[PDB]
Symmetry: C3
C-alpha cells in the first residue's frame, strides 16, 4: 500500500520562462507528463500532485492526464514559498489522517525517473524496514544538488544543499535524487520538527534525513548507478542535457530493434514514434508526435515529420511534413512540404519544391516538380506537370478540384477550383483550366508562338546582339 506525492509547486524562476517549468517538454512530453506516466505504470493506491505557483495553468493538464491514464490524480495546493518539506506537508493533506501505507515522494522535475526505479525503491525500503529511504547517485558535476553526507562507516547522516554546503562539502559528488520512500508516522513527525535556518529560509525536505537519524530511526540510501534516471532539471541548460540523454536512449532502443540511425546525435525521436525494421534514418532528422514509419524506409537527411504515417519501403528525404500519410513504396523529397490532411498513395511521388495541403493523391500518381496541390483529390497513375498550381482560393473562399486516373497534365497548368478533369485527360503546357475537362480530352489555352526576327539587334544593340550577328 503506497501513496505517491509529486512536488511540482515551485515557480522555476531559474528557467526564465512564462511557461510553467514542469510543462516544458522533452521527446514530445512535458516533464510533468513523463513523471506521471512513470508513476501510473507503478499503479500506486494514491497519486497526489502538489501544485503551487501557476497551479491554475497546470491543474487542468493533470486532470487530462488522469483521464488519459485512467486513474484519479489528486491535486493538493501549496500556498506559501516555503520549501519542499512544506510541499510534502501540503501533499499529506490530501490523504486520510489515519493513512498507513508508505509515502513515496518525487519532484516534478526528475523527468527520466521510471517505474522500475520506483518499484526497486519501495522494495528496498520494505526490506530494510527503513523510516526513510533516499535515492542517491554520483555525478561528475553535482552543482545545485543536495550532497550526501556519510559517517566513516559509510552510514548516511544528512543531506546538505548546494547553497548551504561548505567549499569542501561542495566537492562531494554523491547527490540526492530527491526521490524517497517514508514510513508515514516518522515522516509526519520529522516535518513538524523542521525549521528554516538555511540560505533560503525554507523548510527543506532534505533536513528530515538528519532529523530521523538523530531519533535513532533507520535511514537507508539506495545508490542508483544510472544517474540520468534521477537527474533533475532546474534550468534550460539541464533540460537540454537530459533531453539529449533521453533522446540517445530512445534512438538506442530503435537501433537494437533493427533501425539504422546513421547519426544518433542529430536524429531526434519522440517517445511514441514507431519505426520498422531495416529503415535507415539519415542525419539532421526529427520524428515527432505520433509519427509511425514502416520497415525498409529511407528517411532524411534533414527531414522533420510530426504525426506522419509512412508505409513500408517509402523514401522521405529533406521533407518538412505534419498530419499526413505516405503509402508503401512512395517517394517524397527532396525539398517537399506536407501540410495537414495530405494523403499520398502507395508508389506515389511528391518531388522537389512541391507543397501539398489537405489533398488525396492516388496510387502511383506523381507530382514531381515545383507545384502546389491544395484541397484536391487526384486519382491513380496520374502525372501532374512541373510548375502547376491547384488554385483553391479565389481571393475570398476555397474550393475542391477533382483530377481522375491516368491523367497527364502539362507543365504550367493552373487548376482553378472547382473543376473536374476526367480519366486519361491531358492538358497542354501553359493551360489555365477553368471548366471541366472530359475523359480522354486535351484541354489547352496558350496562344500560338510568334518569332519576332532580329528583335535583339534592334532593341539591344550590343551583347546577345553580337553573337546573334
Amino acid at each position: 500500500d503506497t501513496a505517491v506525492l509529486v512536488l511540482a509547486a515551485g515557480p522555476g524562476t531559474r528557467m526564465r520562462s512564462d511557461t510553467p517549468k514542469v510543462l516544458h517538454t522533452l521527446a514530445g512530453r512535458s516533464m510533468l507528463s513523463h513523471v506521471l506516466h512513470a508513476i501510473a505504470k507503478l499503479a500506486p493506491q494514491r497519486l497526489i500532485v502538489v501544485l503551487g505557483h501557476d497551479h491554475q495553468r497546470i491543474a487542468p493538464l493533470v486532470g487530462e492526464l488522469a483521464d488519459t491514464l485512467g486513474r484519479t490524480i489528486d491535486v493538493a495546493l501549496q500556498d506559501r514559498p516555503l520549501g519542499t518539506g512544506h510541499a510534502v506537508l501540503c501533499g499529506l493533506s490530501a490523504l486520510p489522517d489515519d493513512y498507513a501505507g508508505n509515502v513515496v515522494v518525487t519532484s516534478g522535475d526528475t523527468p527520466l525517473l521510471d517505474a522500475d526505479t520506483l518499484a526497486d525503491l519501495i522494495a528496498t525500503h520494505r526490506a530494510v524496514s527503513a523510516a526513510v529511504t533516499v535515492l542517491t547517485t554520483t555525478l561528475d558535476d553535482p552543482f545545485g544538488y543536495g550532497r550526501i553526507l556519510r559517517t566513516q562507516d559509510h552510514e548516511v547522516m544528512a543531506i546538505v544543499e548546494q547553497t548551504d554546503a561548505t567549499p569542501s562539502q561542495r566537492e562531494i559528488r554523491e547527490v540526492n535524487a530527491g526521490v524517497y520512500a517514508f514510513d508515514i508516522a516518522a515522516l509526519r513527525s520529522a516535518l513538524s520538527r523542521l525549521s528554516s535556518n538555511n540560505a533560503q529560509q525554507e523548510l527543506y525536505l532534505t533536513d528530515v534525513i538528519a532529523i530521523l537519524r538523530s531519533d535513532g530511526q533507520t535511514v537507508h540510501a539506495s545508490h542508483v548507478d544510472d544517474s540520468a534516471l534521477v537527474a533533475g532539471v532546474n534550468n534550460r541548460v539541464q533540460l537540454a542535457e537530459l533531453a539529449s540523454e533521453l533522446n540517445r536512449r530512445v534512438v538506442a532502443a530503435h537501433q537494437l530493434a533493427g533501425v539504422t540511425v546513421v547519426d544518433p546525435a542529430t536524429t531526434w525521436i519522440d517517445v511514441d514514434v514507431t519505426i520498422g525494421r531495416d529503415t535507415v534514418i539519415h542525419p539532421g532528422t526529427q520524428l515527432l508526435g505520433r509519427t509511425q514509419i514502416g520497415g525498409r524506409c529511407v528517411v532524411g537527411p534533414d527531414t522533420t515529420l510530426t504525426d506522419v504515417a509512412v508505409g513500408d519501403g517509402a523514401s522521405v528525404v529533406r521533407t518538412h511534413g505534419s498530419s499526413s500519410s505516405i503509402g508503401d513504396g512512395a517517394a517524397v523529397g527532396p525539398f517537399t512540404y506536407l501540410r495537414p490532411g495530405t494523403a499520398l498513395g502507395a508508389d506515389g511521388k511528391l518531388g522537389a519544391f512541391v507543397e501539398v495541403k489537405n489533398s488525396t493523391i492516388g496510387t502511383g500518381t506523381k507530382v514531381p516538380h515545383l507545384t502546389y496541390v491544395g484541397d484536391a483529390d487526384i486519382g491513380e497513375y496520374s502525372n501532374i506537370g512541373a510548375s502547376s498550381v491547384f488554385v483553391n482560393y479565389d481571393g475570398t473562399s476555397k474550393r475542391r478540384t477533382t483530377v481522375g486516373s491516368h491523367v497527364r497534365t502539362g507543365s504550367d497548368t493552373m487548376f482553378v477550383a472547382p473543376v473536374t478533369i476526367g480519366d486519361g485527360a491531358y492538358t497542354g503546357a501553359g493551360t489555365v483550366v477553368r471548366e471541366d475537362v472530359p475523359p480522354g480530352a486535351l484541354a489547352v489555352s496558350a496562344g500560338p508562338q510568334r518569332n519576332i526576327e532580329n528583335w535583339v539587334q534592334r532593341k539591344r544593340p550590343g551583347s546577345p546582339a553580337a553573337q546573334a550577328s
Copy 2:
C-alpha cells in the same frame, strides 16, 4: 610468410537486419570491405574469408573486391553454428596441409583495423617467438567483449567471454580485440582440443589462449592503446558509434591537410572523398561516394553530395546532388536539387528552387530561380528566366532541347522539347516555346493585358472593394 583468415560466418542476429551484417556500411564502405582493404595493403601470401550464414549473398562481393584489389581471395564455408574456433578450423581447410607460415586471424566486424596494426602484430609475434599473440585494448565500456585474464606477474592466462564471466570478471576493462597471430602447429593442436562447455555451447577461439598457456607455450598479449582500431561491432548501436569515430578521423585528416570543417560532428565524409585546400565546409553536410571538391570552395550548410565533382572557388550551399559536375567559380544553392548527368560550367549558377537532371549548362550560364532543367544542353553566358520548365516529357516519351549562348529567356517560359533556341535569342515573359527560335529573334505567345475596371466592387462587394473605393 603469412596467411590471413577473416571470420565472417556469423548470422549477426543482434543487428536485427535482413542485410548480412558484414555488408552494413560506414563512411561509404561495408565492414567486410574495410577489413579486406586493410589486409590487401598488408599483402599477405594467403587471404581466406570464412563465410557461413548468408554466404551466397556475401561471396560474390568478396569476388568483386578481390578483382578491385588485384589479388585472389579464397572463401571457406563454415557449415555449423559452432563458434569462432570452428570458423578458424574451416578457414585452415583452404590452406595446404603442410602450410608453414604464421596464421593471422581477425573478425569481419572489426572495421577500423588497419594494415599498420596487423604489421606490428606480426612483427611482435615473430620477435617474441610466441605460439599465440593476441591484441588487446582497454575500454570504458567493455560489455560483450572477452575479458583479458592475467596472473599477478601480469602474464596473460585466459580470455573469458562476456556471457561466461563472473560479476567480478565483468569489471575487467582490458578486452580481447579478436585479432591474433598463431604458430600454425600450435593453433591446429589447440583447436582439436577445444570443447563447448560455455554459455553458447560453441567452440570459442578464445579458449586456445588458456590451452596454449597450459601446454607451456609462449602466449603474448599486445596492448593496442588506440582502442577504436580494434573495436568490434555486434549491433547497430556499436556500428553507429564506430562510424562516428571513423568519421571524426576522416574529418581530422582533412582539417590537418588544410580544410576548414566548421562542425566535424555534423559533417560526414566518406573515405574516398577528396577536398582542396582552404575549402570551408559548413554544418549539416555529407560528402559521399567519390565526391571531389576543389580548393577555396564553400560547401554547406545542409548539403548532401554523392559522386559529385566540384571545381575550385565554387559554392554549393543547401544542395542535394549526385553524379554531377560543378565547374570552377560556379554558384549552386540554396535549395537546389542536382540529379545524375548534370554538368554545370565554370562561373555558372543554379539558384534557389532549381532542379537539373541530365543536362549540360555552359560557362557563365545562370538558371537562378524556380526552374526545372531536364534533358537539355544550354550554351554559355545565357540567362534562363525565373519559373521556367524544360518540358522534356510529352506524356509517353522524353526529348532533348538545345539553347545557345548569350540567350535571355523570359520568366515563365516553357521549352517543349525538342526545340532549339539560337544564340542571342530572347523569349517573352509567359511564352510557350514549341518551335525553333532563330538567333537574335524574340519568341512570344502571351496574349495582351486587359484591365476590367471596377471588377472588384462588382464581384467582391466588401474588403479589397473598400480601399479600392
Copy 3:
C-alpha cells in the same frame, strides 16, 4: 600600470592555409579580434601587437579594431623566424626604454582568453611580488603544449616544449597557457640570456622561467581550472574544437537567460547575436553576424540567418536569409530564401519555395508559394498568388514594381517591372502584367480554355487512352 603584448608573428604553417592564422574565425570573430576585445576591456596603458609573417595583411585589421575599440594599438614587427622569446623582444621595442609598468604577454592564438583571467593574473603577480607569473592549466590531451616542470615541493622550475620533452615529460598534463606577467627588468635580462639550443633552434620565451628561477627570482604559476580559457590553436582541428567549446558557452548563456535551445550541439550562435525570452530554437540552426531575434519566436530547424532582425512572436523555419528584417508575428518558411534588403512587415508571411531580394512587403501581406519577389514594394494585407514572378530584369537592366494594399493577385502572374498595381486590384490566374492596373480593377491576359475531345485516343492509342475508353 601595464603594457600588454600580443604575439601574432608566426606563420601558422600547421593551419595549411593561405589565410593568415590569427584571421581564422570562430563565433563570428577572428582569433586576433577575440584576443584584442578581451584586452581592450582590461584597458591597459599600452597595447602592442607583434606581427611578422603576413603583417601587411594583418596590420590594417589591427588599425580597424583599434578604431572600433576606441584605443591606439601599436604594431611591432618581428623580422626573423626566431621564436616567441624574440617576438617579446620585438614587442618591447615599442615601449620607452625606461618603461616601468608590468609586462603582460599573451599569444594571438589563445582566442577564449578573457579580461577576468588577465585581471586575476596581474592581481596575483602584484600580490606575490613575482618576477614572472605564468598561467597554467591541466588537460586530458596536452599534445603540442609546453609542460610545466615542478620540484618535489611543487615549485615551478621550467617549461619544456612538446618537441623537446622526454617521453616521460610528455605524460605531464599540466601545461603552459603562454600567458604571463613580467617584471620588466627581469624580463629584459632573461631575454638577452636566451640561446637557441632546442628542436626548433629558436629563442623560446618559455626558457625565461628556468632562467629566472636560476637567478633566485620569484617564479609563480597560477593554475586556471577552466582550461578552455587558456587553450591554444595551432591547427584546424584545435580551431574547431575551441569553436565548439565557445559555441556551447554562448548557447548556455542564452539558455540561462530564457531561450530554449533544443539541441546546443547543432545550434551555432555568433557572439553578438541577441535572442529574446521564450524563443525556441530548433536543431540545425546557425544565427550569425549581428542577428537579433525577439521573444517568443520559433526559429529552425535548419535555418541560417546572418545580420537578420526578427521581431517578437515570429516563426522563421527552414530559412536561409541575410541582411533582412522580419516583423512581429510574421511567418517565414519552410524552404525560404531571403536576400539582402528584404523587409517583411508584422504578421506578413513568406512561404515555401519563395525567394525575396531588396523588397519591402507590408503588414499582413502574404507571399505563400513558389514565388520570386525582387526589387518590389508591396503594401499591406495583400495576397500574392502561387508561382508568380516579379520580373525585375529585362535582359540588361533592373526596375521596381509597386503593388498596393488589399490586392489579390492570381497564381502564375508575371509582374513585368516597372508596373504599379493599385489598391484592392486583382489579377487572373496566368496573367502577364505589363501595364499599370487601377485600384479595384481585374487585370487578365490568359486566353480561353478549349477542350479537344478524344485527343488522347487519337494521339496516344494505348494507356490514358484505355481508361478514357
